[PDB]
Amino acid sequence: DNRIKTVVILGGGTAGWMTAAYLGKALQNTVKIVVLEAVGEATVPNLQRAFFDYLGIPEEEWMRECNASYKMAVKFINWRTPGEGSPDPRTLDDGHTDTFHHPFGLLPSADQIPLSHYWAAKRLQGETDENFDEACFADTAIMNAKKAPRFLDMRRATNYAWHFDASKVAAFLRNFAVTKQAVEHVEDEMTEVLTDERGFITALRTKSGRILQGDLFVDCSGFRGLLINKAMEEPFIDMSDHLLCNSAVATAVPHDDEKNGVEPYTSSIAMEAGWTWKIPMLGRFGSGHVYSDHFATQDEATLAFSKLWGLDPDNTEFNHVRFRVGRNRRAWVRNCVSVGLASCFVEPLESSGIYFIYAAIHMLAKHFPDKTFDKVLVDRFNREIEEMFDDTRDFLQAHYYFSPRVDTPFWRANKELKLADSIKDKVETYRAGLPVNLPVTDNFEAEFRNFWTNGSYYCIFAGLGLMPRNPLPALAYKPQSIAEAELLFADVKRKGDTLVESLPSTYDLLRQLHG
Amino acid sequence: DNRIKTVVILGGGTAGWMTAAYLGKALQNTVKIVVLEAPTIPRIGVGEATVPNLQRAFFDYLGIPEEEWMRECNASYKMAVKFINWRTPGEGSPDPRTLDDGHTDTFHHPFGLLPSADQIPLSHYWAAKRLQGETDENFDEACFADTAIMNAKKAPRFLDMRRATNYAWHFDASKVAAFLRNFAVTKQAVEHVEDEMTEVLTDERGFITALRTKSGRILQGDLFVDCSGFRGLLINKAMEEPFIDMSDHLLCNSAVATAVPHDDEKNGVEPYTSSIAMEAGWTWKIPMLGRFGSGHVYSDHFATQDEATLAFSKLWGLDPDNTEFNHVRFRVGRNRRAWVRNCVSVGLASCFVEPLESSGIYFIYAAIHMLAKHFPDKTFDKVLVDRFNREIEEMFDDTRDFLQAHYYFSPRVDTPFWRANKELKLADSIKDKVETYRAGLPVNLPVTDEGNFEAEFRNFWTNGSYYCIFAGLGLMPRNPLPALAYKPQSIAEAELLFADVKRKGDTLVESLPSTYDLLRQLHG
Numbered sequence A: 001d002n003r004i005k006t007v008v009i010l011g012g013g014t015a016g017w018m019t020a021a022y023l024g025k026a027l028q029n030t031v032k033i034v035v036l037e038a039v040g041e042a043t044v045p046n047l048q049r050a051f052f053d054y055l056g057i058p059e060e061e062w063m064r065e066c067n068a069s070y071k072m073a074v075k076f077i078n079w080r081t082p083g084e085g086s087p088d089p090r091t092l093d094d095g096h097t098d099t100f101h102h103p104f105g106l107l108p109s110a111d112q113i114p115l116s117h118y119w120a121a122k123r124l125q126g127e128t129d130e131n132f133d134e135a136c137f138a139d140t141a142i143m144n145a146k147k148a149p150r151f152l153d154m155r156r157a158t159n160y161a162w163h164f165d166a167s168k169v170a171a172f173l174r175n176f177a178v179t180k181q182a183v184e185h186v187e188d189e190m191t192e193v194l195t196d197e198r199g200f201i202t203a204l205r206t207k208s209g210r211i212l213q214g215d216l217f218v219d220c221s222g223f224r225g226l227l228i229n230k231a232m233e234e235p236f237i238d239m240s241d242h243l244l245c246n247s248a249v250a251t252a253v254p255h256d257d258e259k260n261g262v263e264p265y266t267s268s269i270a271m272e273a274g275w276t277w278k279i280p281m282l283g284r285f286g287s288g289h290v291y292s293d294h295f296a297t298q299d300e301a302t303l304a305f306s307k308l309w310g311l312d313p314d315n316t317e318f319n320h321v322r323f324r325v326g327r328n329r330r331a332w333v334r335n336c337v338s339v340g341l342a343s344c345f346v347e348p349l350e351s352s353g354i355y356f357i358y359a360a361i362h363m364l365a366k367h368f369p370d371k372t373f374d375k376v377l378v379d380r381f382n383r384e385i386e387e388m389f390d391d392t393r394d395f396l397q398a399h400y401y402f403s404p405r406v407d408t409p410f411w412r413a414n415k416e417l418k419l420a421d422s423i424k425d426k427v428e429t430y431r432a433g434l435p436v437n438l439p440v441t442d443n444f445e446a447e448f449r450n451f452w453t454n455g456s457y458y459c460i461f462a463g464l465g466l467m468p469r470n471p472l473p474a475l476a477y478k479p480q481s482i483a484e485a486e487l488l489f490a491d492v493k494r495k496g497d498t499l500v501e502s503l504p505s506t507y508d509l510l511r512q513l514h515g
Numbered sequence B: 001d002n003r004i005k006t007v008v009i010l011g012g013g014t015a016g017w018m019t020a021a022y023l024g025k026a027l028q029n030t031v032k033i034v035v036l037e038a039p040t041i042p043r044i045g046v047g048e049a050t051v052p053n054l055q056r057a058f059f060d061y062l063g064i065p066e067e068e069w070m071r072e073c074n075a076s077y078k079m080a081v082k083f084i085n086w087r088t089p090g091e092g093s094p095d096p097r098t099l100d101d102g103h104t105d106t107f108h109h110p111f112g113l114l115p116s117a118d119q120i121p122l123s124h125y126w127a128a129k130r131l132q133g134e135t136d137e138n139f140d141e142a143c144f145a146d147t148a149i150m151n152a153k154k155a156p157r158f159l160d161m162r163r164a165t166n167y168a169w170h171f172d173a174s175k176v177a178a179f180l181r182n183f184a185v186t187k188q189a190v191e192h193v194e195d196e197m198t199e200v201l202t203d204e205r206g207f208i209t210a211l212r213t214k215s216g217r218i219l220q221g222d223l224f225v226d227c228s229g230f231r232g233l234l235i236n237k238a239m240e241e242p243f244i245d246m247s248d249h250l251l252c253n254s255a256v257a258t259a260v261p262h263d264d265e266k267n268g269v270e271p272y273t274s275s276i277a278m279e280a281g282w283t284w285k286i287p288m289l290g291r292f293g294s295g296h297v298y299s300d301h302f303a304t305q306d307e308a309t310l311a312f313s314k315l316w317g318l319d320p321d322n323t324e325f326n327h328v329r330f331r332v333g334r335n336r337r338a339w340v341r342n343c344v345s346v347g348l349a350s351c352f353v354e355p356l357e358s359s360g361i362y363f364i365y366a367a368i369h370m371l372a373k374h375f376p377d378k379t380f381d382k383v384l385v386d387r388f389n390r391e392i393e394e395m396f397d398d399t400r401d402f403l404q405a406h407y408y409f410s411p412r413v414d415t416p417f418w419r420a421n422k423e424l425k426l427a428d429s430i431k432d433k434v435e436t437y438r439a440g441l442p443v444n445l446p447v448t449d450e451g452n453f454e455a456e457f458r459n460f461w462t463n464g465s466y467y468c469i470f471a472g473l474g475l476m477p478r479n480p481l482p483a484l485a486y487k488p489q490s491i492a493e494a495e496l497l498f499a500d501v502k503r504k505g506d507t508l509v510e511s512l513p514s515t516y517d518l519l520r521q522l523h524g
């Protein structure tokens, strides 16, 4: 029996308890699992497919217990126009309002060419004045009209994801893991990492003087990286040479949901020296001003943040976070596997924080080792983590670098950074009018490999006003296909109007769900 | 109007007429299409195997139903490539030798899907059982119902034409060419010009402006497709584009073929291609109604044309001086670039490998499909051309590396040929994939549960196709997937899957018509 007998997870929160619950189910009680534990969060839609569905927790159950709201997109306010941050969208050089959506809805195709490409043709040839988001996604109409992505009878209308309270999801999962899945919770500080002759972790020593013996160690200890970085001496690779923000300042804002209604989407509100998220939940919205401390002091950032929402700076409670941007040289060294902030991090601009946790966990269960820790098993895991991370890093860079804004040392400095080759090649592709990572769907392997696809690139490039040099040349030969595409643009308008009518509001569906 | 107005395709056969017909439909009569095909001295119909996307990606785009094109080219069904005597040594025979461990030296590469338990493919459960002596089934028979059906020579459809398994096609290349030509000429406006090309007229930049024919006629053009075969008369000669020889990866460079009349009532018809291993290469067997096409692929460095012809005739009991043979020398590799200036290469003029996994035609409609997607106007955006070139090299190198693995992990070392294969360097791509496989991990999991052409082309050789070949040749993981040691419920779920396979195979080996009976119905 060469098997792992005991997994010790250091640290709780989302990262530790997601790890404990997933490994609980994955390893079928053949392995003892121990956790050692002393603003709002947006997600992407595979969270139910790839995590809660594996645990066999239905969506309503976990939603009800963590004050969960619906998310149909990230919406980008004032990313093109200059000046101080505001929740009200400014008006562009060409007159229109500086808002663009990145929804989770699919793009339909004619003649095996996505609708994105027909719209580009029309826009480039002056034959429409519609923005991409409005013309191509029914979702957009629905988000403008603050509607829910399900009917009251809970028939699905669009694809969607989730806003929630991180700490409440942790709490729900801990409880799940302890009661339903044999996980031992140990409330105590870690004070020493005991390591054998080979540099493997043998145990964690607690403050109470107890030792937690182990075989595999999961570091969910946050940015401190107490196992992967400190104990194991694995270097962390700084990537503020790709993304400038390194600091945030957050709070919850009580919100009149009867008066205003609830936005079924995350809002990225552009700012002096960074941006500010807005994550609607029932009764309150979480918000945080992400910034670079090289381009704005903690105070400058806090004043601007309070100003945005009309909050009293000395009458309001703030969380101040410095964060690493980058990733470990390797996620997994000897018998230390890193997950969440201890592994890698990026500003939550496209809501990748939680995706990274269950991506890592999923890959850990697949590459789960015995005690020989086969080098290849560990390597293949490390490889998947770096590809995953670098991809999402390069996508985020694109958000900044192709912003037209040059009205602040921050916004200008973004354009002084080197584009990674991957995103340079993709832009060159996009400019020729070609698609960029055509999606492989009309299992989680498919979702994770091909994660940012054609539609997500049009959403951001188009949204920021980067366009192809010219239409896709093939379109100049496909008059029947152009025609078929109009009937698709029509189908979109019809779908959006029939649903903006018949759908309940977000607010009405939340009220039902939480009662 | 900066558009291409005229496409000139040089050469006919599968490549030229597939290009003419596809571009005919794709470009919706906004472009004049001309084919320039030499007068054709009839060869013997040596048979062509395909992969299953042929109907989805090509005939269905043209809106030609499967039965129509099948009836017109004497088409038979193909459920796998079956590999006879790739592990045991000695002279070629259609009868499989017996291994030291008492199994018969046959393994299948079918088109069937692998089910998963606990997000782990069945291949991995079978490896666990095999490694731990808890089964003596080979991978193919344990995991694919298709295998039982192929052993029992059954059809992949019932007589009522309900589908039973996945499948592809055997046919006469020249007859498909003929059917398509006729399609393209009558139903799609294509002008057919029967004549030799003698001159490639080029502008100041080396772009092709026209082709001159032998009759002295001049064929003006905007885009030129070279479907001229290995001679590469536009892409290689006229355009001076170098071809990259890759006999540093695959040794065969010659074949010798014929059609063999076959007693279908006596023996039945095999619903599969057979790769029969040989002295200095291998021999395909492509069953059609009444006859099977066969060819002994060989390396001319390890066997003379004669040696090869004697061995080939010996195999099937054919009289060497009383039988009609086609002799082919072929280049193995690909152009430095498929598409230079306004000359796009398709088929043998683009790139080629021995038809070991039946990739010949796939390469043609892959290229054609990518041409329609990257179709240019007259400014020939160099990025459009580059992106196309990139897709063709990745596609080719992938299938090259797959084929290498067929030879390199053969245990055979009983002939200068078989030993020389082991002296070649593995490409890094396939070295990394073997290292992966050996740790017990999967190799390119498919993106299909049970789709659009993007999915098929990117992820073309997947986990199941790697197990089929590695396992089939007896390369196995160093040990089981370690995760399996923690998932007893998952192991259990997998047995119900192995059972579902046995059940499926026995119910169908009973209820299915024979291949022979379905062909007879189809060819009324």
Ligand SMILES: N[C@H](Cc1c[nH]c2ccccc12)C(=O)N[C@@H](CO)C(=O)O
Pocket (backbone or CB within 6 Å): B051, B052, B109, B110, B111, B112, B113, B114, B445, B446, B447, B448, B456, B459, B460, B461, B462, B463, B464, B465
């Ligand atoms: N590549 C297969 C389908 C396929 C497409 N062209 C082929 C040409 C030869 C054989 C198979 C195929 C796939 O996607 N999945 C299977 C492999 O048998 C799996 O479950 O791994």
